[PDB]
Paper text:
The assembly (folding and membrane insertion) of OMPs is mediated by the heterooligomeric β-barrel assembly machine (BAM). In recent years, our understanding of the mechanism by which BAM mediates OMP assembly has advanced considerably. It is now clear that although BAM is composed of a variable number of subunits, BamA is the major functional component and is sufficient to catalyze OMP assembly under very specific conditions. Unlike the β-barrels of most OMPs, which are extremely stable because their first and last β-strands are held together by a large number of hydrogen bonds that form along the entire length of both β-strands, the first and last β-strands of BamA are held together by only four hydrogen bonds that form at the β-strand termini. Biochemical analysis and cryo-EM structures of BAM-OMP assembly intermediate supercomplexes have revealed that during assembly the BamA β-barrel shifts from a lateral closed state to a lateral open state and thereby enables a conserved C-terminal motif in the substrate (the “β-signal”) to bind tightly to its first β-strand (BamA β1)25–29 in an antiparallel configuration.
For two of the structures, we crystallized the BamA β-barrel bound to darobactin and then soaked in either CP1 or CP2, and for the third structure we co-crystallized the BamA β-barrel with CP3. Our x-ray crystallographic analysis shows that, in contrast, CP1 (B, pink), CP2 (C, yellow), and CP3 (D, teal) bind to the lumen of the BamA β-barrel. CP1 and CP3 seal the lateral gate from the inside of the barrel via interactions with residues on both sides of the gate. Both peptides form primarily polar contacts with BamA, but with different residues. In contrast, CP3 sidechains R3, D8, and Y10 contact N666/E435, K610, and S658, and thereby form entirely different contacts with BamA than CP1. In both CP1 and CP3 co-crystal structures, Q466 mediates interactions with the peptide backbone. The suppression of the antibacterial activity of the peptide by the BamA(E470K) mutation strongly suggests that the E470-R4 interaction is important. Although the two peptides interact differently with the β-barrel, both compounds trap the C-terminal residue of BamA (W810) in the interior of the barrel. Curiously, CP1 and CP3 lock the gate shut by binding to residues on both sides of the BamA β-barrel seam while CP2 appears to constrain the flexibility of the β-barrel that is required for the formation of a lateral-open conformation.
Residue numbers in the entry:
A (entry chain B): 2 to 16
B (entry chain A): 423 to 810
């Protein structure tokens, strides 16, 4: 995961 | 029993990352898994307390609550400068619709405390829409908001395995809207998709199609806050571009720099002779964003069949755009039109991933094939660990 402040972005590389 | 966890990672996107936490399933016999965790990287310190019951109903409807804190320094994320210290809480119900789908519905509260904002057009345009009129010639300022939101989500996950997927898709849709009584008035939606299509019977040649979309806007005359903007570019979105570089760039007002020193570089400093608005190459994000990628996974060359399942080789074409739907092009005719969604950035590259004993290692080398004025390239990118 990567955070953009409080927003979350699931990175495809972690799937 | 309770457990503690401590990790350290590194990547080109966020630098050294530190992770620390405690977790207890069925904490004190309550049926709630309780966690306390913190993270720190180049631009953010984040901490949270979470309490979740996976079986709020006997049918697996979950109820979770969270307390959180965020300290963010925008210049450290390669954006035009500002500091945000925020905190809040939320409560979320999770509904397992079927094997591969879940829905989420929640309520949230968030306090945002903005300060040290370097004056620039798009940011001041949002502030003006809120009735805030700070000076354009100084970075000493303050703006605080308190918002209440309804939050919703949908996740579809039918990926064939938890690492190196070869088939299936993962789709995540997240949205929110402010509730009357909030300082801000806006809605925001994000959609992420990753779809893998195997070509051969042995699933060694796979096509990945990936998309990411973001759209938010103000309700009424207020705009969506710039601290909720979308970004693109970097090791995990549009590879080969510097982190968050894609899209609008700050148009600075002439200002007296907070700690001037002729030994360092400043944006639109009066001490340097600035008497008018300055164009820059500092990204600010936008309220609209779209990213698309086509990636061809192939067998890894010169590696053993026994250790092939541990390494993934791929070749990709990444594409991305970010724009500001409220950019007033007619008022700023002497600057690029930041409201234009058609400035699509593109890059081509290669990626190598290794599920090492220590954890996931990802390396990529990509070259921008289409870029615009102010975009910064970062051809070689990498990440070590599970935080990006
Ligand atoms: C560790 C036990 C926590 C119980 P809850 C909080 C009690 C007051 C502080 C969990 C709420 C989740 C959103 C109340 C249970 C449901 C109404
Ligand atoms: C190999 C997977 C391709 C997945 P799609 C295309 C992605 C292009 C970058 C859909 C293709 C339909 C034929 C995902 C679209 C989601 C909004």
């Amino acid at each position: 995961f990567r955070r953009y402040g409080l927003d979350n972005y699931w990175v495809x590389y972690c799937g | 029993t309770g457990s503690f966890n401590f990790g350290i990672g590194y990547g080109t996107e966020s630098g050294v990352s530190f992770q620390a936490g405690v977790q207890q399933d069925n904490w004190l016999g309550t049926g709630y898994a309780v966690g306390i965790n913190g993270t720190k990287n180049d631009y953010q310190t984040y901490a949270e307390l979470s309490v979740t019951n996976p079986y709020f109903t006997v049918d697996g409807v979950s109820l979770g609550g969270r307390l959180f804190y965020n300290d963010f320094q925008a210049d450290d994320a390669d954006l035009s400068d500002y500091t945000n210290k925020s905190y809040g809480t939320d409560v979320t119900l999770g509904f397992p619709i079927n094997e591969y789908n879940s829905l989420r519905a929640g309520l949230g509260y968030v306090h945002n405390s903005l300060s040290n904002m370097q004056p620039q057009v798009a940011m001041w345009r949002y502030l003006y829409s809120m009735g805030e009129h700070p000076s354009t010639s100084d970075q000493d300022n303050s703006f605080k908001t308190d918002d209440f939101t309804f939050n919703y989500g949908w996740t579809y996950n039918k990926l064939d395995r938890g690492y190196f997927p070869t088939d299936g898709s993962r789709v995540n849709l997240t949205g929110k809207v402010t509730i009357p009584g909030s300082d801000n008035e806006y809605y925001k939606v994000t959609l992420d998709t990753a779809t893998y299509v195997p070509i051969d019977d042995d699933h060694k040649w796979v096509v990945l199609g990936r998309t990411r979309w973001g759209y938010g806007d103000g309700l009424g005359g207020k705009e969506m806050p710039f601290y909720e903007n979308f970004y693109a570019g970097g090791s995990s979105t549009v590879r080969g571009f510097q982190s968050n570089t894609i899209g609008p760039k700050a148009v600075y007002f002439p200002h007296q720099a907070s700690n001037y020193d002729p030994d360092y570089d400043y944006e639109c400093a009066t001490q340097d002779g600035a008497k008018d608005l300055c164009k820059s190459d500092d990204a600010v994000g936008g309220n609209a964003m779209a990213v698309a990628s086509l990636e061809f996974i192939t067998p890894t060359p010169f590696i053993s069949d026994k250790y092939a399942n541990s390494v993934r080789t791929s070749f990709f074409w990444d594409m991305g755009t970010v724009w500001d739907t409220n950019w007033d092009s007619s008022q700023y005719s002497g600057y690029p039109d930041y409201s234009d969604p058609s400035n699509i950035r593109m890059s081509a590259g290669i990626a190598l991933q290794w599920m090492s004993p220590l954890g996931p290692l990802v390396f990529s080398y990509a070259q921008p094939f289409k870029k615009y004025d102010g975009d910064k390239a970062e051809q070689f990118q990498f990440n070590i660990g599970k935080t990006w």
